[PDB]
Enzyme design. Structure first.
Site, PDB file in Angstrom:
ATOM      1  N   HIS A  28       0.094  62.235  67.297  1.00 57.45           N
ATOM      2  CA  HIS A  28      -0.606  61.629  66.170  1.00 57.45           C
ATOM      3  C   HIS A  28      -1.014  62.661  65.120  1.00 57.45           C
ATOM      4  O   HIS A  28      -0.764  62.462  63.928  1.00 57.45           O
ATOM      5  CB  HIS A  28      -1.794  60.823  66.690  1.00 57.45           C
ATOM      6  CG  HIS A  28      -2.668  60.252  65.613  1.00 57.45           C
ATOM      7  ND1 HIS A  28      -2.192  59.457  64.594  1.00 57.45           N
ATOM      8  CD2 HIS A  28      -4.001  60.357  65.396  1.00 57.45           C
ATOM      9  CE1 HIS A  28      -3.193  59.103  63.802  1.00 57.45           C
ATOM     10  NE2 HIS A  28      -4.303  59.643  64.263  1.00 57.45           N
ATOM     11  N   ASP A  69     -13.503  62.783  67.722  1.00 56.89           N
ATOM     12  CA  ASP A  69     -12.966  62.478  66.406  1.00 56.89           C
ATOM     13  C   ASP A  69     -13.794  63.198  65.352  1.00 56.89           C
ATOM     14  O   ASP A  69     -14.862  63.749  65.636  1.00 56.89           O
ATOM     15  CB  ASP A  69     -12.965  60.956  66.192  1.00 56.89           C
ATOM     16  CG  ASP A  69     -11.999  60.492  65.109  1.00 56.89           C
ATOM     17  OD1 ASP A  69     -11.260  61.312  64.509  1.00 56.89           O
ATOM     18  OD2 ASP A  69     -11.976  59.262  64.883  1.00 56.89           O
TER      19      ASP A  69
HETATM   20  C1  HEM Z   1      -7.521  53.305  65.906  1.00 57.20           C
HETATM   21  C2  HEM Z   1      -6.794  54.139  65.160  1.00 57.20           C
HETATM   22  C3  HEM Z   1      -6.935  55.657  65.165  1.00 57.20           C
HETATM   23  C4  HEM Z   1      -7.322  56.440  66.170  1.00 57.20           C
HETATM   24  C5  HEM Z   1      -7.734  56.052  67.602  1.00 57.20           C
HETATM   25  C6  HEM Z   1      -7.275  57.806  65.679  1.00 57.20           C
HETATM   26  C7  HEM Z   1      -7.646  58.910  66.443  1.00 57.20           C
HETATM   27  C8  HEM Z   1      -7.625  60.204  65.984  1.00 57.20           C
HETATM   28  C9  HEM Z   1      -8.013  61.381  66.729  1.00 57.20           C
HETATM   29  C10 HEM Z   1      -8.558  61.351  68.164  1.00 57.20           C
HETATM   30  C11 HEM Z   1      -7.808  62.451  65.961  1.00 57.20           C
HETATM   31  C12 HEM Z   1      -8.067  63.920  66.357  1.00 57.20           C
HETATM   32  C13 HEM Z   1      -9.460  64.380  65.959  1.00 57.20           C
HETATM   33  C14 HEM Z   1      -9.451  65.096  64.633  1.00 57.20           C
HETATM   34  O1  HEM Z   1      -8.506  65.882  64.393  1.00 57.20           O
HETATM   35  O2  HEM Z   1     -10.413  64.941  63.845  1.00 57.20           O
HETATM   36  C15 HEM Z   1      -7.305  61.999  64.685  1.00 57.20           C
HETATM   37  C16 HEM Z   1      -6.935  62.784  63.625  1.00 57.20           C
HETATM   38  C17 HEM Z   1      -6.409  62.356  62.421  1.00 57.20           C
HETATM   39  N1  HEM Z   1      -6.072  61.051  62.105  1.00 57.20           N
HETATM   40 FE1  HEM Z   1      -6.201  59.461  63.357  1.00 57.20          FE
HETATM   41  N2  HEM Z   1      -6.827  57.819  64.346  1.00 57.20           N
HETATM   42  C18 HEM Z   1      -6.612  56.487  64.030  1.00 57.20           C
HETATM   43  C19 HEM Z   1      -6.166  56.032  62.814  1.00 57.20           C
HETATM   44  C20 HEM Z   1      -5.660  56.838  61.807  1.00 57.20           C
HETATM   45  C21 HEM Z   1      -4.956  56.374  60.622  1.00 57.20           C
HETATM   46  C22 HEM Z   1      -4.652  54.892  60.322  1.00 57.20           C
HETATM   47  C23 HEM Z   1      -4.641  57.453  59.899  1.00 57.20           C
HETATM   48  C24 HEM Z   1      -3.874  57.555  58.576  1.00 57.20           C
HETATM   49  C25 HEM Z   1      -2.941  56.675  58.195  1.00 57.20           C
HETATM   50  C26 HEM Z   1      -5.134  58.630  60.593  1.00 57.20           C
HETATM   51  C27 HEM Z   1      -5.058  59.930  60.144  1.00 57.20           C
HETATM   52  C28 HEM Z   1      -5.549  61.044  60.830  1.00 57.20           C
HETATM   53  C29 HEM Z   1      -5.591  62.391  60.315  1.00 57.20           C
HETATM   54  C30 HEM Z   1      -5.147  62.832  58.905  1.00 57.20           C
HETATM   55  C31 HEM Z   1      -6.113  63.189  61.281  1.00 57.20           C
HETATM   56  C32 HEM Z   1      -6.354  64.712  61.166  1.00 57.20           C
HETATM   57  C33 HEM Z   1      -5.035  65.483  61.328  1.00 57.20           C
HETATM   58  C34 HEM Z   1      -5.201  66.970  61.094  1.00 57.20           C
HETATM   59  O3  HEM Z   1      -5.794  67.355  60.050  1.00 57.20           O
HETATM   60  O4  HEM Z   1      -4.770  67.762  61.977  1.00 57.20           O
HETATM   61  N3  HEM Z   1      -5.724  58.213  61.770  1.00 57.20           N
HETATM   62  N4  HEM Z   1      -7.202  60.629  64.743  1.00 57.20           N
END
Ligand code: HEM
Length: 446
Positions: A302, A166
């Protein structure tokens, strides 16, 4: 330009300490609280400048943010320009197809006036800072709730509880960050209130702050792992390898961080570790129709739901710069114990663990709230696809407790649909304003 000496460090840098505590408080006596906010808190609030320098990391990094009712308690009746912040997250819960009846009771209301974020390499130093705060403020501050969090151990450091690396992808702020390949580049005012090209007029004392969306998101890790094994696509590899592929299709990256868009059939751990390569994609592939091709990455993955890149237009070659105003800075940290042997063996969660979600943005309606409601929870987002029903984000998508219909995950047939139980369960949270440091001993203590 951007005055990073006055911006709280978690907004743009993160605390980068092993341990964090989120200390949610009420203000009982604003006169005494203000005196100690200026004398005891303001001098130890860590700035972006301080945390950006390897040799100026404090023993205890401290940030502080206030809810709408906390600002009112301090006599601050100004309009900060954000209706979602003013109303509080409990009133916004239905926007995300959840109910406050499931929340931590302290979040299901507006009694919380603020949060102190304390971060240190050991919990003992955090506890000592808390004890000092409670001593000097006396009853003028009162703890209503707290959540302890930690970087995960060993080779899972920097990974969230499901095991995925992450913190890879963040917006680059034009003029502040040196952009990485594929990284979006945005005006500072997308994240920092009153900074360049923030279209919302702010009170003068609030320039340099950001809105903090806090979410306590429980993760059902044994259940997620078992789901992947039970639904793994057929193929020649081991069952676990095929289960891992399904998990990567759901997230949009392998656990190593390698983006599936660039390596769709197997992990590439060297790619995942390389910040110069692991974000260098747009979802477009010459010779493939962007509206129908899910062979590289599902439309429901996601990261594709939360940063759509070419799905919302713009450059087909990196960097894609679409939807810059919908960017968020993330500073979330895992919470709870590691999965125990018995939980893994029974495929059953018996202790609460998850992500202490922290999202920063200058407009809640364009950042966290928009990503959750209009993108992740919208079965018809991204637009213009075939089949048009993308389904919900399999990680964070919500539909009032129902299993989520998620399409496109199976590489052999993009029309195949899965009905997926929630693996992330909201326990609620709150919306805060992290002020510029000058406002802490300034307006807020006046
Ligand atoms: C337990 C809940 C969550 C988990 C397990 C999770 C997990 C992850 C993972 C593994 C990544 C990819 C690593 C990265 O690109 O830095 C990521 C990216 C991201 N997450 Fe989540 N996340 C969670 C909650 C959320 C929530 C609630 C939001 C927004 C409403 C969110 C928004 C984002 C965004 C904006 C990215 C980067 C996308 C990009 O720039 O390509 N995440 N998350």
């Amino acid at each position: 330009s951007l005055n990073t000496i006055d911006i709280q460090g978690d907004i743009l840098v993160g605390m980068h300490k092993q341990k964090q505590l989120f200390y949610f408080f009420a203000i009982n006596d604003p006169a005494t609280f203000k005196t100690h906010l200026a004398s005891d808190i303001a001098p130890v609030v860590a700035s972006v400048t301080q945390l950006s320098n390897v040799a100026t990391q404090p023993l205890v990094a401290l940030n502080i943010a206030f809810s709408n009712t906390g600002l009112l308690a301090l006599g601050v009746t100004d309009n900060l320009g954000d209706s979602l912040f003013a109303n509080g997250q409990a009133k916004d819960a239905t926007s995300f197809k959840e109910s406050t009846s499931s929340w931590v009771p302290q979040f299901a209301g507006t009694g919380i006036h603020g949060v102190i974020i304390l971060a240190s390499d050991t919990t003992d130093l955090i506890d000592q800072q808390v004890a000092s705060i409670e001593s000097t403020f006396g009853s003028s501050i009162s703890k209503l709730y707290s959540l302890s969090a930690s970087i995960r151990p060993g080779n899972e450091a920097g990974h969230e509880m499901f095991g995925f690396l992450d913190g890879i992808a963040q917006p680059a702020i034009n003029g502040f960050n040196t952009p990485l390949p594929g990284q979006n580049i945005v005006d500072a005012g997308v994240i920092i209130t009153g900074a360049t090209n923030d279209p919302i007029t702010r009170p003068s004392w609030a320039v340099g702050g950001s809105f903090l969306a806090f979410r306590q998101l429980e993760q059902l890790v044994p259940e997620f792992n078992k789901y992947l094994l039970d639904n793994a696509p057929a193929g020649s590899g081991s069952l676990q390898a095929r289960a891992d592929l399904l998990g990567a299709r759901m997230v949009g990256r392998w656990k190593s961080g390698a983006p599936i868009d660039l390596t769709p059939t197997a992990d590439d751990p060297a790619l995942g570790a390389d910040a110069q390569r692991n974000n260098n994609f747009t979802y477009s592939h010459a010779g493939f129709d962007l509206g129908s091709d899910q062979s590289h990455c599902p439309f429901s993955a996601h990261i594709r739901k939360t940063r759509p890149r070419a799905d919302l237009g713009g450059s087909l070659t990196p960097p894609n710069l679409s939807a810059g105003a919908n960017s968020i800075m993330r500073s979330g940290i895992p919470y709870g114990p590691e999965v125990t042997s018995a939980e893994s063996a029974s495929n059953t969660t018996t202790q609460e663990r998850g992500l202490a979600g922290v999202a920063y943005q200058a407009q809640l309606s364009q950042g966290f709230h928009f990503l959750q409601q209009t993108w992740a929870d919208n079965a018809n987002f991204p637009p213009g696809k075939t089949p048009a029903t993308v389904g919900l984000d399999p990680i964070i998508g919500q539909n009032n407790g129902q299993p989520r219909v998620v399409n496109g995950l199976l590489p052999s047939n993009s029309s195949a649909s899965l009905s997926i139980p929630q693996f992330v369960v909201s326990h609620g949270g709150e919306y805060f304003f992290s002020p510029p440091i000058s406002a802490i001993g300034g307006r807020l203590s006046a």
